[PDB]
Automatic annotation (TrEMBL), chain B:
The gene is cbh_2. Transmembrane segments: none annotated. It catalyses: cholate + taurine = taurocholate + H2O; taurodeoxycholate + H2O = deoxycholate + taurine. This is choloylglycine hydrolase. Mg(2+) binds at E90, D91. InterPro entries: CBAH (IPR047711), CBAH/NAAA_C (IPR029132), Ntn_hydrolases_N (IPR029055), Peptidase_C59 (IPR052193).
Automatic annotation (TrEMBL), chain C:
Transmembrane segments: none annotated. This is choloylglycine hydrolase. The keyword Lipid metabolism applies. Mg(2+) binds at E90, D91. Keywords: Hydrolase, Lipid metabolism, Metal-binding. One of its GO terms (molecular function) is metal ion binding. CDD domains: Ntn_PVA. It holds the Pfam family CBAH. InterPro entries: CBAH, CBAH/NAAA_C, Ntn_hydrolases_N, Peptidase_C59. It comes from Lactobacillus gasseri. It is an enzyme of class 3 (hydrolase). Residues 1-312 form the Choloylglycine hydrolase/NAAA C-terminal domain. Pathway: Lipid metabolism; bile acid biosynthesis. Coiled coil: none annotated.
Length: 324, 327, 329, 324
């Protein structure tokens, strides 16, 4: 439910997926010569390869978030109550919602290139199957340049926003998310100067009183504000393992523990998995609620010119290293 | 920095330790026949065994948090600016702050019995050499109940802890009172008694947590962790319990960069310890290695007389999946 | 600024005006036969009478807030950084922003009528004079039905929204204001049931812990959320004096004391005046920062068929009632 | 429910009184030779004159807030659930809670005087009469030096605190009120500097986003924080009428409107009256919920050598000035 683009040296793209129902997700590599059959676009027999997290149904990857081999990344996040899809129209490039990640990563390589080519796009109301109605999504798109954009189809059509904070959660519309950001302009990671009650000595009784109003709620605006802050103040100039460890810490600070986000009677949205994808090197790191150890899958260990989905387990059991 | 007692079925006692300076911590078992040289109390050559996280100086275990073989846990958290120690007094049991954890765990079994035996105690200003840091303590046991032990300018206090958690400043009664400020928080959606007769755009799940504290400061972590701990799953086996415990503490984790205690110097979560009181096992991980390790105290010669030390801080232990070793 | 429509029995429309400098506002009655010379619309030599707070420039009322004799009210509030006006166009009915309140109150009777007639409207970039550039505004329109609308011209054009909370402040765009209200759905005036830490007895050490996260800042969102709450929970079924009294207290809940809203180097926005207009009776009640005693001007005690502005002072000195004067009269 | 000491030039001492029911309060001058019968202290047949707001019962002024002719002020505020009174004892000077304001103003002139002479005081559990059991109170005391103390009798006995912010509300204990102030140390009247997300240009869409976390609730803590802020930033170097005007506005910023503070089924705590007492001049200014016009009673226009209470009406009907 929280997606970030983290640029300490290399560039890392990933997300927490928080929900109360699973969708058979696995780690799925789609090689260069798997044939995408799009609903209303020309089928691509050869295309960029990609690795990400996906459900697989009737030999089709239904990606939740992924990156391709040229350093482009796309994540889809619930947009329930905000999104609107539109019927196929005879003068636009019609991408169905479930195939947006596939189509973008198969075809383009940079955010700037995605921007120039979404100008004719319509996100259509086409669903994958009758027993799989399209879900309401909006998308974060980042690349190796450290810049990202937000893609939102709503009542007023398709919108592409520049994303100055390289993060995204759920509702409301993206310009309202950014507006809300300014309500926390006074937050600081250390201690503020006392211009609150000038001339009075306040006992600064705790460290980091400058974050006393930083949101810790499980709702979409709270996670958006906190993760923007965590991401902006995270370390830079780190090697691979340090950068990947920091990426998980960032997303861990807005994780949803079971019991805190109630969505029905004893039904809870919680952080099902976290994914971390190196854009330069094509490596997908991940963990999940039940297993905190970080696993990794490298796209280049496989034959990118093959033509079948390569599939690994996402959800794992707790992998405790016993010491004595 | 954040310590909890979690009672889903078994009982788990542990803490995040958040700071900017490390103190050579390690896992440390103290067996029954290690000789405790107490600064102003009788030497204890035979005592309960215990396991925790500690620094070892001059062959002495300086514990941050630990449990003993009877199922009593004690954790020490920073109390800077709030605590006061006092000179050794003629009429009281004088425990030095740096040895409070060792003494309480070597001597007692239940939190109830720690309460009875604290009434004549004075926490002294004696240091190790290394001056004594300002701490207060959370004490908990297998009854699922816990106490707060604070020495401040008004003397030694012991408080029943109704939320089984503790962070840093201010004094514990103020922490508890501040909780009532969050009485409207719920994990789901509230009923709209805010603007009766108006249909609110409930645009997000869990709008009931919109005012839940997420700051890195001491009151914010206390309010969040109490809520996380109170709403965590119950009636669960060992591994699931341990998994939920670590998630509770991760929700009040301090990521590098968010808590600035100096010029480009940051307080962050250095390690997370989780200790099963029934089974004497210490699970832990640290900032650089997210994989949980375990040490079982009962798989050692608890009759020995030397300290058994293991490593705490480990490198990231990644599990590479598509190694193509084709075994 | 904060504007509200309040409906205990009669219907009361009005606002706080919060700012750092005054514009010569007075109480101004525009009678039925004052000739409105609009910028790109036909003049209206006969029209509804209206009373409100306005600046007078070249014998022209420049209303900040007013009501007309038929019980319609319009208030203009700062929309700086969100509003946009558009060049005059032939495909549309062009109303300049400085004349929106005058034109609507001269011409229309009800919020419904206003809605129907805004469907072809353009808020133009025309200014009263080359030397009085047009400020950025949005408007609250309410009437005796107890319903109101919000009128906003922004980047994407003109918009008219039903206002379910009968209040308005400044930025952001009105849909975003309503969204932000949901962030406070847990607020109650009394004490909440403890679903926070079930099983823990939390001492409710203060009354009204349910309002502990109610916003008190001077910013636009804070004042919007607080005044919506104040207005929703205010008493009903009151008679005249009682209703006016509660109206002023509602707007008082979000007033700006000097010193708390710094808008420039030692420059402060503060509540300059508060206006309360009975839609049914044509009576304008007011006080101001320096005088808390309420004053009243009845439109209907005046000759409404005439054609010159009838003008009364708005800002007054503090009007203190000295009790033990011992004039022993 | 909120009391302040305001020091723009002269010194002003006063309070909002918020509650759900009135106790027949009036403006009451007690002249120098009205005889006080104290429960456990010698009668004072002559003493300082005082003016304030009081319930009168059996020809006794039961003050809620008042000032004396030497420029000392005391205000009693509800302390329910925190305060404790103790049985009369021989070892101490026993002041009953209902008489605390009268005894202090009759006997002393400065806050320093009060501080010294409280070192042997017990606030007793004695009640004024069987029909009026003692309510739980704590007190703000201020004088013409511009400084104030807080007097609190709780579980651990009597406490006197210097008050750095010259304000007081209800629970919790005063050192906890002070500690909570530091949680708002980043609040500013204007725009903060963006140390929140460095490198990002936040759109500052509203004036005064620095007050976005200033409390506006009706609870005791919220009103305390906001009134400290209003009082700290209020104008200075003003003459009489401007100072009174700002004094009422300071207290209006934490006014309790009917409907916002529910204390039972359709029972509301609201701001019943506001008093503003000039310490130098002995003038009591007031208004009330039903009448926003300010009224004034001047102590020094009465014969302060008399011995009967001089009473004036406090609650008044809305006094509207009809212009035409
Ligand atoms: C519920 C969850 C988002 C909650 C957060 O915000 C985080 C979303 C994110 C990605 C979604 C899947 C995308 C691929 C197809 C598309 C098809 O249209 C429906 C099935 C499927 C698998 C989607 C299911 C579900 O909607 C997913 C997992
Ligand atoms: C997160 C937080 O509260 C920081 C606490 C941290 C700085 C404390 C916690 C335990 C302390 C050590 C206990 C043992 C010993 C005691 C001695 O008096 C000083 C030296 C030791 C190692 C303490 C150091 C430090 O204050 C520790 C780690
Ligand atoms: C509290 C707040 O929102 C401030 C609003 C305030 C500064 C506005 C509100 C009405 C404006 C006047 C309308 C009439 C006229 C219009 C003309 O374009 C410019 C001059 C006038 C007097 C406006 C001045 C100012 O923007 C006013 C008062
Ligand atoms: C806003 C707030 O804190 C409410 C306080 C309010 C209800 C208190 C304040 C002063 C109290 C009276 C003092 C005099 C007398 C004392 C006696 O023990 C009981 C009766 C009196 C009149 C008190 C009533 C009430 O508690 C008052 C008004
Ligand atoms: Ni006279």
């Amino acid at each position: 439910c929280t997606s970030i683009l983290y640029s300490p040296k290399d560039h890392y793209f990933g997300r927490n997926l928080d929900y109360e129902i699973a969708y058979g997700q696995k780690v799925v590599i789609t090689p260069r010569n798997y044939e995408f059959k799009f609903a209303n676009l020309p089928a691509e027999k050869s295309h960029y390869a990609m690795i990400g997290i996906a459900a697989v149904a009737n030999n089709t990857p239904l990606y939740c978030d992924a990156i391709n081999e040229k350093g482009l990344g796309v994540a889809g996040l619930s947009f329930a109550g905000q999104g609107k899809y539109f019927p196929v129209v005879e003068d636009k490039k019609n991408i169905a919602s479930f195939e947006f990640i596939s189509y973008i990563l198969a075809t383009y390589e940079t955010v700037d290139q995605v921007k120039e080519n979404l100008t004719d796009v319509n996100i259509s109301d086409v669903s994958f199957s009758k027993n799989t109605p399209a879900s309401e999504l909006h998308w974060l798109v980042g690349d190796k340049t450290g810049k990202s954009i937000v893609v939102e189809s709503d009542e007023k059509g398709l919108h592409v926003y520049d994303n100055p904070v390289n993060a995204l959660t759920n509702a409301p519309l993206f310009p309202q998310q950014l507006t809300n950001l300014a309500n926390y302009a006074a937050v600081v990671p250390g201690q503020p100067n006392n211009d609150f009650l000038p001339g009075v000595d306040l006992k600064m009784y705790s460290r980091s009183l400058g974050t006393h109003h930083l949101p810790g709620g499980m709702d979409s605006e709270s996670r958006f504000v906190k993760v923007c802050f965590a991401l902006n103040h995270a370390p830079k100039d780190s090697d691979e393992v340090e950068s990947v460890t920091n990426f998980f810490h960032i997303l861990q600070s807005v994780e949803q523990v079971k019991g805190m986000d109630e969505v029905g009677p004893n039904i809870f949205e919680y952080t099902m998995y976290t994914s971390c994808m190196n854009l330069e090197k094509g490596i997908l790191y991940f963990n999940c609620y039940d297993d905190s150890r970080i696993s990794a899958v490298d796209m280049n260990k496989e034959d990118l010119s093959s033509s079948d989905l390569i599939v690994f387990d996402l959800f794992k059991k707790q992998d405790i290293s016993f010491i004595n």
